[PDB]
């Protein structure tokens, strides 16, 4: 497996594939239920239905294989051969391929210079086309035919003159005879009127025939190839008048002849000529035409494949006609389409053998065209073949496309054996690598291993008896099972699996019941609630799979979340409450027996058991040797006249008993801690432990913390009751005062003194003030010993707004369709809302719920798009070859006389790599290629450095992918990234994970549409697709004088650049709210008005660095609005991916097209090649494009087809003949090969393991 080349399939190849030829619509007999002869399912073309059984029965046994019986001709082999072998249908009248036409012009390609309507009215038998003309022959005999037509006109005029003479004679004769007769007064006048009416009619037909002669003559003078003759009567007239110099035809046959006689080389030359000197949209049309023509010219495949001649058929088992119980049947819809095409072809053949009219045969050929097209894709034209009438018919194309297509449901996401699922319950007695599996689940997962073990232990006599015993389920089987499951990892997994912590390995363990048991600490990483959930439990089998689950996917080696390098496996619901209750300042209860001095902790717990002491009370505690003192206690020490090293010996402190216990939980080497732990400080110390200790110790301390936290949370005694939540007493007074004020304003509105809109505006203001005031009063009232304050302050669970609306008035509630009411709710959930208050609360509740469902759909889609563009990048080099870097500000917002580190230094420069060394006082402070943590950054800012040159991926120059040195250190491991890691996929997952969590929207439009910029997730996608912003603000082109022209029709902005450059004029809406002064100096980068900048022009005018920094800043400020933080490397990967391509301009010497997308690498190679050749390099400009366009444009067709849009890409790849090499990830996942990312990489696969000679000597 080295490539998958694809090209246009000619008729000869289709014949080669065929092992026969279909000649009937028959499938099976109605009474014998066996396949018929020479139709569909025929044994003689596809293969025997039963293993080695020929249809007649001449051969029925297995021994005599590889022979054909002369009775029915069936070849005896395995029935599975039917699944492969294919036949082919013949066509009496050629038809055209639907896919390559009736679409965008990037696949049709304008090969023949005709509008789509022309083809649509030729290849459906509605007009004529002139396939070929003897144009030279027509000019050779021009004088002769001209003379003949002149003679024809001469005799026409002579005959007409004779007709005039006869008419005049008749008129005179009848007039004379009737006036002589005198039958009535004026008979002569009446007959003369009749005669002149007859003359008029004869003249009318005379001019009509003259017209027909002149028009057929000028049409003859208007002969050329590729001319449509809509009027069939006209074409017939041409044919009767003249033949043997022009040939015309209808339907796909004319196109087939035209392509056969086509000369793509001459067309390519002409198109190059017009591209050299051409203007307008004609240049774009000639560009597309050149693109498609070049494709045929470069590739050996001939264009005649556009119009097929034989229709391939599927092997029958891919379209099974399975038998169902009850006498019914079942068939895939492809059978019906094949039957229709076969029937229509047969009837056309029958009608062609007998002399038949042109009308009927043309109609039948049109029907055949309609049928074959449906087979390629039903419903691409007119109305879809409905078949039974309740639904369309699934065609061939429909199986390769969409959510349910073959690509995205059967090559990427497959089903798998050795798996299970069940509800989950929390298990606190486990460790960080243990999970409980029910007996039945474990038994059914490990059945082969249990059977092998049973036979080895002699409980079971044989494999069959072992199977019988395990199915019976006797106690010996369960004992063997309990023996066998251990030291074997199982991968637990949850359904959404947003990020790579979704699948985690555990060591199993038997347990009664039927619900999995899981470790609480890891629950928050999955996002696994226990309301009611379910978790898949996959089982690795091979040695490699279990080894991987041991080393990589273990639940104990995934402390740090890769989004931002912070701990994720230390949840806080019930345990942080216990720890906070432990290390809490006094007043948490009545501090009984405080201030004493105790010999050691042991005496403290004995006193506590005695009940005199309280866990919260400041007392003096000694510590035996080996207890490291507090970090800040290092300077202070005891009082002595001799040197004393309290870093490692006895020392007395003032602290609480609970602080002593908490410190006892932590490792002995860890210094003391004497503050509240809460949620942030606990995360900080966990981060410190994960940084500075091996993994097993970290896990052990996490488990001790879990146990102690649960126990002390139980001891805490937090509750909720009627008296636990008390409304502030001051609420009623203040709210009634504000009600009085509101009533006064309502009264003064009743007199019309104030407008309704204004009244609503001030009510909003006053009630916002009132709700803020009551919130402050409630916050002041509640002590810190109240159960709720404990669980909200500690960081366990809850936010103060929920408390505000539980105990304080809920207040302003948005009305429907993003409006605000003037009368806020004046009650709390404790007090109890009223009816209309409940209704107007529901107004917002339902909208909130709807939003969440929609958000999941949008975030999921975004995450999918992100991965596909970013999949290719992989760290494929240990260290870079270059030195260029990227400048970052180390410390910003530096107050007067001091230096302050930036608030978000953690997500900007931490974990990067310093490319060049730094010297501020003549000495190195941060050595090169050393990461940036708290200590180094603190020292650097203390020295007073303002900016640094951090190495980063954008400037990284690596021949293969991107080196590890530039990428910095990963976040989930806390160490430099190993070679071959998939940084693209983790980047995309990190970007996409919080998309659900964004869940923010403009609270009120404010009555103006288009002013407020898109916010939240839409903004992000609007960022990541290069989409021009909804509210766009033009940017200054360059320095100069800017002024406003307020034309009545529409506002207008005009800036004349300085230095005499050309004046530049931009438009602007009437509602501007501009800020730049009129007739004033402007700078290059400044924006003209409020809105949102368009990335394209910033790239065009400023530079790639400007758009890069603007993009990362914009997305990061969007994200951190709610509070989510991600590192900048994740975004930088994608932002680098966007700009990889380039727009070639002035493609003169490069010889390829101008103004089309080009990979940067191929641009550089072509430029080097052409400058080496002596020709100048074609120019180029950076071009920012969305993630989607970029993914579709990827070189490998197979990966592109696996993306959302399939038909266009497959068609373009087919016409271009692009062989896809299997380098990449999404290309190799479908083939089932090893992804070249990490353990699958080459250098990591070709080692040999040998025991040492001394080891073999040891024995």
């Amino acid at each position: 497996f080295d490539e998958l080349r694809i090209g246009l399939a000619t008729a000869d190849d289709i014949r080669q594939w065929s092992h026969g030829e279909v000649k009937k619509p028959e499938t099976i007999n109605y009474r014998t239920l066996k396949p018929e002869k020479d139709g569909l399912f025929c044994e003689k073309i596809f293969g025997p239905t039963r293993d080695w059984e020929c249809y007649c029965g001449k051969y029925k046994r297995v021994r005599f294989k590889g022979i054909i019986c002369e009775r029915c001709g069936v070849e005896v082999t395995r029935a599975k051969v039917r699944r492969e072998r294919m036949g082919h249908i013949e066509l009496a009248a050629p038809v055209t391929h639907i896919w390559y036409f009736k679409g965008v012009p990037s696949r049709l390609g304008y090969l023949l210079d005709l509008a789509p309507k022309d083809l649509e009215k030729v290849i459906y038998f509605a007009a004529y086309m002139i396939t070929f003309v003897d144009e030279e022959r027509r000019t050779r005999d021009l004088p002769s035919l001209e003379a003949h037509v002149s003679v024809e006109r001469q005799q026409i005029e002579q005959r007409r003159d004779s007709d005039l003479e006869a008419r005049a004679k008749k008129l005179e004769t009848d007039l004379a005879e009737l006036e002589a007769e005198g039958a009535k007064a004026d008979v002569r006048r009446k007959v003369r009127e009749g005669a002149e009416r007859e003359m008029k009619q004869l003249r009318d037909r005379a001019q009509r025939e003259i017209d027909r002669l002149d028009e057929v003559w000028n049409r003859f003078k208007n002969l050329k190839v590729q001319d449509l003759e809509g009027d069939e009567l006209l074409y017939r007239e041409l044919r009767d008048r003249f033949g043997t110099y022009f040939d015309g035809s209808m339907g796909a046959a004319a196109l087939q002849k035209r392509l056969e006689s086509f000369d793509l080389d001459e067309e390519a030359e002409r198109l190059r000529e017009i591209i050299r000197t051409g203007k307008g949209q004609k240049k774009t049309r000639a560009l597309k035409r050149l693109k498609v023509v070049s494709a045929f010219l470069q590739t050996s495949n001939s264009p005649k494949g556009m119009v097929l001649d034989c229709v391939p058929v599927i092997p029958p088992d891919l379209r099974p006609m399975v038998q169902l119980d009850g006498g019914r049947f079942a068939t895939s819809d492809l059978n019906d389409l094949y039957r229709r095409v076969i029937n229509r072809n047969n009837r056309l053949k029958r009608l062609l053998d007998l002399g038949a009219p042109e009308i009927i045969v043309n109609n039948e050929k049109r029907m055949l065209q309609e049928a074959v097209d449906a087979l390629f894709d039903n419903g691409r034209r007119g109305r879809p073949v409905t078949g039974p009438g309740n639904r369309p018919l699934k065609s061939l194309s429909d199986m390769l496309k969409g959510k349910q297509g073959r690509f995205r449901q059967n090559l990427l996401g497959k089903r798998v054996d050795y798996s299970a699922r069940s509800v989950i319950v929390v298990g606190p007695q486990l460790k960080l690598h243990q999970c409980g599996l029910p007996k039945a689940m474990a038994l059914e997962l490990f059945k082969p291993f249990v059977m092998k073990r049973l036979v080895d232990l002699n409980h079971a006599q044989n494999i069959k008896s072992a199977k019988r015993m395990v199915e019976r389920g006797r106690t010996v089987v369960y004992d063997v099972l309990e023996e066998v499951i251990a030291e074997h990892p199982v991968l637990l997994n949850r359904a959404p699996t947003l990020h790579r912590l979704g699948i985690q390995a555990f060591e199993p363990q038997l347990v009664e019941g039927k619900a999995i048991q899981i470790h609480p600490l890891v629950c928050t990483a999955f996002n696994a609630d226990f309301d009611g959930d379910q978790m898949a439990v996959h089982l690795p089998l091979s040695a490699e799979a279990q080894a991987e689950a041991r080393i990589l996917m273990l639940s104990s080696n995934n402390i740090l979340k890769p989004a931002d390098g912070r701990p994720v496996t230390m949840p806080t619901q019930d345990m942080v409450l216990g720890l906070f209750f432990l290390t809490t300042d006094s007043e948490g209860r009545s501090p009984k027996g405080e201030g004493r001095a105790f010999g050691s902790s042991a005496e403290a717990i004995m006193a506590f058991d005695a009940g005199d002491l309280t866990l919260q009370a400041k007392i003096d505690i000694r510590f035996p040797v080996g207890t490291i003192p507090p970090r800040g206690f290092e300077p202070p020490a005891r009082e002595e006249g001799e040197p004393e090293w309290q870093q490692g010996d006895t020392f007395t402190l003032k602290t609480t008993l609970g602080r002593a216990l908490f410190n006892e939980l932590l490792p002995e080497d860890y210094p003391f801690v004497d503050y509240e732990v809460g949620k942030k400080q606990l995360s900080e110390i966990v981060n410190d432990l994960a940084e500075r200790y091996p993994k097993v110790i970290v896990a052990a301390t996490l488990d001790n913390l879990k146990a102690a936290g649960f126990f002390w949370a139980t001891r805490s005694g937090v509750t909720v009751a009627i008296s636990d939540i008390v409304v502030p007493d001051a609420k009623k007074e203040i709210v009634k005062g504000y009600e009085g004020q509101d009533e006064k304003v309502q009264k003064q509105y009743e007199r019309g003194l104030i407008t309704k809109e204004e009244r609503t505006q001030e009510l909003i203001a006053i009630w916002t003030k009132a709700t803020n005031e009551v919130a402050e009063a409630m916050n002041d009232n509640f002590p810190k010993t109240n159960p709720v304050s404990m669980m909200v302050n500690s960081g366990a669970r809850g936010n103060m707004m929920q408390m505000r609306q539980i105990a304080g008035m809920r207040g302003l509630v948005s009305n429907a369709k993003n409006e605000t009411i003037p009368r806020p709710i004046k009650a709390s959930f404790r007090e109890g809302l009223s009816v209309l208050e409940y209704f107007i609360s529901t107004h917002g509740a339902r909208k909130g719920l709807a939003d969440t469902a929609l958000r999941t759909a949008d975030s999921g889609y975004l995450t999918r798009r992100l991965v596909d563009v970013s999949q290719d990048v992989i760290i494929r080099e240990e260290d870079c070859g270059t030195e260029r870097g990227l400048k970052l500000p180390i410390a910003t917002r530096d107050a007067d006389g001091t230096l302050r580190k930036a608030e978000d230094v953690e997500t900007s420069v931490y974990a990067r790599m310093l490319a060049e060394d730094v010297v501020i006082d003549g000495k190195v402070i941060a050595p090169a290629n050393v990461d940036l943590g708290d200590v180094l950054i603190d020292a650097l800012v203390a020295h007073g450095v303002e900016e640094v040159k951090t190495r980063s991926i954008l400037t990284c120059e690596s021949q293969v992918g991107t080196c590890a040195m530039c990428y910095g250190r990963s976040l989930a491991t806390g160490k430099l990234v190993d070679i071959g890691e998939a940084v693209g996929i983790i980047a995309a997952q990190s970007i996409g994970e919080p998309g659900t969590q964004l869940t923010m929207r403009t609270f009120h439009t404010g009555g103006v549409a288009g002013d407020d910029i898109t916010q939240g997730l839409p903004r992000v996608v609007e960022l990541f697709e290069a989409r021009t912003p909804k509210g766009v603000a033009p940017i200054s082109e360059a320095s100069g004088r800017v002024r406003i022209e307020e034309t009545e029709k529409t506002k207008k902005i005009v800036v004349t650049p300085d230095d005499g450059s050309d004046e530049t004029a931009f438009p602007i809406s009437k509602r501007a709210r501009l800020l730049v002064g009129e007739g004033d100096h402007v700078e290059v980068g400044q924006k003209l008005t409020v809105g949102a900048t368009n990335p394209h022009d910033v790239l065009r005018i400023l530079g790639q660095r400007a758009v890069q920094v603007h993009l990362v800043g914009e997305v990061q400020k969007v994200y951190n609005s709610q509070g989510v933080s991600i590192h900048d490397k994740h975004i930088e990967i994608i932002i680098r991916q966007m700009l990889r391509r380039v727009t070639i301009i002035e493609s003169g010497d490069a010889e390829l097209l101008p103004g089309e997308l080009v990979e940067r690498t191929k641009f550089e190679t072509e430029n080097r090649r052409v400058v080496q050749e002596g020709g100048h390099p074609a120019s180029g400009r950076p071009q920012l494009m969305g993630i989607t366009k970029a993914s579709l444009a990827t070189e490998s067709w197979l990966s592109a087809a696996s993306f959302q849009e399939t038909t266009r890409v497959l068609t373009d790849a087919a016409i271009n003949a692009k062989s896809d090499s299997l380098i990449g990830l999404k290309e190799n996942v479908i083939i089932g090969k090893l992804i070249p990312a990490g353990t699958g990489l080459s250098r990591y696969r070709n080692i040999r393991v040998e025991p040492t000679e001394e080891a073999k000597a040891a024995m």
């Binding site: 109605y30 509605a126 006498g327 039957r339 009837r347 029958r350 002399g355 009308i359 029907m367």
Partner: protein, 298 residues
């Protein structure tokens, strides 16, 4: 869409009356005699042959005149017969086929209009098509008319009685037996698509709910392999000669077993010797010693 274009293709053509149609038929027979004379191997004058050819061409033109005229009638009949499984437009084409057949077999000798003669052949062609290409599992014509007669008479029974008639009653009105009744009732069903919604708007297909049977169960396959190995082991435990003769008799190396005397050619023994050693082999293998390991296999 396409049927609209075909009706347009019909467009406006001159309808036929008695005098016009009989004159056309006269030209038809004139041309038929002309081409008959042309086909004769006897030498004919060149100008005479061209005269015969042009009158034959004029007769062909008259033919197409009749067909283009009566397209409207045949599509009317197609409407009468459509909606029963086949496509409407295909029925129209089949009616056109019946029309060309009938006009090939019409003459003015009949003292009536076209509409009474052609319509019989149009009805014939449509009925044949509807009986031949309607059902996926094709039924033959005799059984097809059996099905339709049963269906219509059963509908008449429902209309009259208003209840489901007893099988014997239907058998009597049909005069067949109840066995043939259930047979024909089962023969008249229709396939149900595997791509049906399965009653679910999305994510489901009736084609992904029924398990196959060709697939080899790994459990049974490995059990068979262990059976083969254990039997071969116990077979080797016995004498190599006894082993070989039993193996060739029961065909443990090839699919087809060999007869007794069939073994007495390669091994050069008698048809009764081979029987004797086979018998004592069955006696030994019947011993409980070399049976236990084979008991669970059955």
């Amino acid at each position: 869409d396409p049927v609209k274009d075909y009706l347009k293709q019909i467009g406006k053509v001159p309808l036929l009356n008695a005098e016009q149609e009989v004159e056309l038929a006269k030209r038809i027979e004139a041309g038929l005699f002309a081409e008959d004379k042309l086909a004769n191997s006897d030498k004919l004058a060149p100008k005479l042959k061209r005269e015969l050819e042009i009158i034959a061409e004029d007769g062909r033109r008259a033919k197409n005149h009749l067909l283009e005229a009566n397209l409207r009638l045949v599509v009317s009949l197609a409407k009468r017969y459509t909606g029963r499984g086949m496509l409407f437009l295909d029925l129209i084409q089949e009616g056109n086929l019946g029309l060309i057949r009938a006009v090939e077999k019409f003459d003015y000798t009949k003292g009536y209009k076209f509409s009474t003669y052609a319509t019989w052949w149009i009805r014939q062609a449509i009925t044949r098509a509807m009986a031949d290409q309607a059902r996926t599992i094709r039924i033959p014509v005799h059984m097809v008319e059996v099905i339709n007669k049963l269906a219509r008479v059963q509908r008449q029974m429902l209309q009259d009685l208003g209840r489901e008639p007893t099988p014997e009653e239907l058998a009597k009105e049909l005069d067949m037996t109840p066995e043939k009744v259930i047979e024909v009732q089962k023969y008249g069903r229709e396939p149900i698509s595997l791509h049906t919604p399965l009653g679910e708007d999305g994510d489901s297909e009736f084609g992904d709910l029924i398990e196959d049977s060709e697939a080899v169960v790994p459990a049974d396959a490995v059990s068979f392999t262990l059976l083969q190995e254990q039997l071969h082991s116990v077979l080797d435990t016995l004498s190599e000669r006894e082993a070989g003769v039993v193996s060739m008799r029961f065909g443990l190396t090839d699919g087809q077993p060999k007869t007794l005397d069939e073994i007495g050619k390669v091994y050069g023994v008698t048809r009764e010797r081979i029987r004797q050693i086979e018998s004592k082999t069955m006696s030994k293998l019947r011993h409980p010693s070399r049976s236990q390991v084979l008991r669970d296999y059955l």
